[PDB]
Amino acid sequence: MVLSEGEWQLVLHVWAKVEADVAGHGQDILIRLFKSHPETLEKFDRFKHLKTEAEMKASEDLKKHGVTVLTALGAILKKKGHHEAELKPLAQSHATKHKIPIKYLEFISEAIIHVLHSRHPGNFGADAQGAMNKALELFRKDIAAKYKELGYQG
């Protein structure tokens, strides 16, 4: 699909707020993912021992991983759709090593939208949320096509 420049600017204006504190946003998004869809935590051999939200919040390693994840996504979003180079390594690791189905990328997209809706109503009204959804749908479309090329059904 293709986003307009106006849609990308709605995406990037909320991402600017995420970047005030990427670590805290990443904690909220990964915890939301794990609480809403507990099966996703089982894909993380390093983190699946965490039993409760308190343990997740206290995990320095989970915090650092959330920064890694949201910084990678932010670099993709800043490409405004021209993200082929960024998707190659991410698709290869997520298809082949981590084995993350497209359904689970849908779940993390839902968690991202949920947390931005909660934290950022000033920059995440209905039009801005639709633009973010379109950007995440494009990310998932393009990663699913790369999954197929790499041999993984997703």
Ligand code: HEM
């Ligand atoms: C917005 C979507 C996502 C982004 C941008 C993203 C990004 C990343 C990055 C940058 C890494 C480290 C380098 C690499 O291994 O590729 C990583 C690792 C990983 N990702 Fe993701 N990821 C996403 C979604 C998911 C989802 C939904 C799952 C699981 C349900 C997942 C599971 C993993 C695992 C298991 C690792 C390894 C963690 C470790 O170091 O122990 N990823 N991800």
